[PDB]
Structure 1
């Protein structure tokens, strides 16, 4: 088990443009295309991203490429963020994967804003953290996913993914 396998599980894989859980144009493996209501604006972003006229459709190899790029940006984002970086450095490997997962889904900004959880993470107060994270839109909107991630944080193992 690793970050790649983890996110593939949580995000699924789809070769056609689609609406995410928030109604956003997305494709491949959780790759957000646009927050805009327009399918054309979405098709346009996708062609720009892929470098070709796709027609709202990509191949497997193309989704994986976007995925690679996205995992990489998440990591680099974390390491560039003043609030995030130290958090990341204080963690074990499984738990660093839980942070990337969240960053992937909600962005640096979203994550950085979970201030109280951040302090707990650092103090390594596992159980409390799990309770705190549950008190969130994130958890209310995508419970099963958030539960997997929260267990990950709580236990430091990959059990939720097995």
Structure 2
């Protein structure tokens, strides 16, 4: 298992424009297009992203390309973030994948909002405690099954929630 397989599991794959859990236009493997309520706005962001007139539909290869781009950017956002980097650097390989998953999902910004607490606990290696803290969040309440998988990953350092 690895970050790609993990997120491929959490996000699914849709080749046609769709609304995410928050109701935003997305496509592919969790690729947010726009927060705008306009399908046309979405369609235009998509063409700009793909480099072609898609008409709201892409191929699998196109989806996979956006996905790689997106995993890379998350990794790089973490490494540039003064609050995230140190956390990421203190973790083992499994747990980092868990941190990338959160960032991919909520943005570097969304995650920044956990550092003061859960992230600190992670950095200190208090697995059980961070897991409880992580669960007290809008993130957990809105997307509980996914949050549970991520949280189990941080808790145990294994891929069990994904097998």
CA drift at 1:30: 0.2
CA drift at 1:113: 1.3
With the length of structure 1 as denominator, give the TM-score of the two structures. Answer: 0.99
CA drift at 1:101: 0.3
Q: Equivalent residue for 2:80?
A: 80
Number of matched residues? 162
Q: Distance in 1 between matches of 2:111 and 2:80?
A: 13
Deviations 1:107-141 (A, max 9, x none): 00111110201110111000001000000000000
Describe the SS at the equivalent of 1:15: strand
Report runs of 4+ in structure 1 exceeding 3 Å deviation.
none
Match runs of 1:23-102 below 5 Å: 23-102=23-102
Describe the SS at the equivalent of 1:148: helix
- CA RMSD, aligned part only? 0.4
Q: Runs of 5+ in structure 2 lacking a partner? A: none
With the length of structure 2 as denominator, give the TM-score of the two structures. Answer: 0.99
CA drift at 1:155: 0.2
